[PDB]
Ligand SMILES: *[C@@H]1O[C@H](CO)[C@@H](O[C@@H]2O[C@H](CO)[C@@H](O)[C@H](O)[C@H]2NC(C)=O)[C@H](O)[C@H]1NC(C)=O
């Protein structure tokens with residue numbers, strides 16, 4: 001299929017109307033970031049020649 | 051298509067697999083880059099059909115309905131100004147969908163301020179949004195309201211100068 | 221930068237060769253339409269909110285903070301005066317209470 | 320077949336036909352000794368970085 | 370698949386090590402990939418090659 005980009009939302013814009021929140025949600029989200037790798041060392045002489 | 055060459059190439063092992071895997075990683079990284087840049091909203095916003103924004107003109111940055119590519123005049127000018135086992139994989143997002151993402155971002159930031167980037171899109175008049183931005187840089191709302199015609203004229207003139215400068219600089 | 225929504229605070233958690241951030245953010249919810257104006261015209265003077273925004277539920281005008289609906293009476297304590305009513309486009313007529 | 324290592328007892332159930340064993344690198348890791356038909360494991364001698 | 374970003378780094382490093390170990394099994398045009406076989410089969414003028 002041809003993928004959809006999003007649900008379609010039409011913002012009710014007019015020149016004298018505003019939307020004010022009357023409530024709130026405390027939302028906790030995760031963000032995973034890599035920091036380091038495995039520290040690998042290779043003996044070049046032993047790898048090539050043993 | 052030389053079979054003797056491939057029989058000799060099998061002596062070197064999995065070099066070809068490493069080159070293909072590195073190129074595959076680059077190829078999926080490009081789509082990930084486009085996804086991180088443009089797909090920052092999961093709601094496709096549209097501007098209202100009446101472009102009454104208190105004198106502010108966004109026609110050079112909003113999509114042109116007369117064009118089949120649904121691009122803005124600035125985006126149309128930008129797309130006009132850019133000109134053996136090898137294959138070119140197409141990008142996952144087409145230029146029409148990237149333009150649709152930018153149109154949704156423009157509609158969100160015009161009709162709803164910065165509210166759509168932090169939650170639900172809360173509508174606000176554009177001369178009020180501008181006043182909020184004025185208060186963000188430490189200038190009182192009255193300054194924006196009293197001089198709203200001059201600020202709208204300056205904004206429209208600067209947007210036109212942007213289009214002229216892009217069209218006049220190679 | 222620190223999660224989706226208005227960022228409040230964050231918590232770090234260790235992970236194998238990585239870090240996990242628990243971003244605690246504030247998301248607005250249950251929004252309601254209101255009729256808004258840039259300024260209030262009273263006694264030939266234009267009144268603008270000091271920190272909030274003028275809203276109307278249909279008959280009465282209030283001032284509320286922008287990220288949460290908390291209507292308060294439009295007074296001189298929460299508004300400031302700049303100019304007359306002839307300049308601001310969309311100014312409406314409402315009384316401004318004096319404590 | 321030449322190499323260096325420590326020859327130790329093993330618990331690898333070789334099938335009768337099977338004589339030696341190979342690791343991912345294709346270096347011999349176990350061998351069946353002639354004359355006595357026993358199965359000797361080949362473990363590389365201790366090494367590391369100074 | 371929540372922790373895929375760290376597991377991707379772990380898999381890439383392990384796969385690079387596995388490829389580097391696997392490359393010892395290739396002879397690269399020589400008669401054998403084992404050095405002891407070449408040193409036990411050939412005189413040093415051709416074992417050098
Ligand atoms: C604020 O008012 C507008 C218009 O009165 C509402 O927008 C309408 O919402 C309904 C229900 O989703 C749709 O069927 C209409 O097409 C919308 N009209 C327009 C012009 O967008 C909006 O939902 C109201 N907002 C709130 C929070 O009640």
Ligand SMILES: *[C@@H]1O[C@H](CO)[C@@H](O[C@@H]2O[C@H](CO)[C@@H](O)[C@H](O)[C@H]2NC(C)=O)[C@H](O)[C@H]1NC(C)=O
Pocket residue numbers: 022023024025250
């Ligand atoms: C604001 O939202 C919270 C939930 O996010 C509402 O709290 C709920 O209220 C209903 C009915 O009173 C209860 O059945 C739920 O158990 C409540 N949930 C929680 C988590 O407490 C709250 O009522 C809303 N307030 C307003 C003014 O709309």
Ligand SMILES: *[C@@H]1O[C@H](CO)[C@@H](O[C@@H]2O[C@H](CO)[C@@H](O)[C@H](O)[C@H]2NC(C)=O)[C@H](O)[C@H]1NC(C)=O
Pocket residue numbers: 101107108109110
């Ligand atoms: C917004 O800007 C556009 C372009 O800057 C205006 O469109 C021009 O309108 C005049 C007169 O109507 C024409 O002579 C030009 O040819 C138009 N230019 C283009 C590129 O279409 C438009 O009038 C402005 N105002 C509104 C409300 O859209």
Ligand SMILES: *[C@@H]1O[C@H](CO)[C@@H](O[C@@H]2O[C@H](CO)[C@@H](O)[C@H](O)[C@H]2NC(C)=O)[C@H](O)[C@H]1NC(C)=O
Pocket residue numbers: 277278279280
């Ligand atoms: C807008 O809000 C005001 C204040 O909350 C409302 O005025 C009150 O309405 C209740 C219900 O009829 C009365 O009991 C109070 O005496 C009113 N107070 C005042 C000071 O008049 C008003 O009704 C609201 N309007 C709408 C359309 O919701």
Ligand SMILES: *[C@@H]1O[C@H](CO)[C@@H](O[C@@H]2O[C@H](CO)[C@@H](O)[C@H](O)[C@H]2NC(C)=O)[C@H](O)[C@H]1NC(C)=O
Pocket residue numbers: 261313
């Ligand atoms: C808001 O109030 C002002 C002043 O009370 C009104 O302006 C007056 O309007 C009448 C009739 O339109 C004129 O005869 C007066 O000369 C005006 N006075 C001034 C000082 O301008 C204005 O009409 C009111 N607006 C609304 C929407 O009620």
Ligand SMILES: *[C@@H]1O[C@H](CO)[C@@H](O)[C@H](O)[C@H]1NC(C)=O
Pocket residue numbers: 015016102104309310
């Ligand atoms: C808003 O638009 C209406 C017409 O739809 C107009 O009567 C009114 O004056 C406008 N207000 C502002 C502040 O532009």
Ligand SMILES: *[C@@H]1O[C@H](CO)[C@@H](O)[C@H](O)[C@H]1NC(C)=O
Pocket residue numbers: 353354355
């Ligand atoms: C000699 O080797 C054979 C295997 O080829 C074995 O059966 C036999 O027992 C061995 N004899 C001696 C004396 O080691």
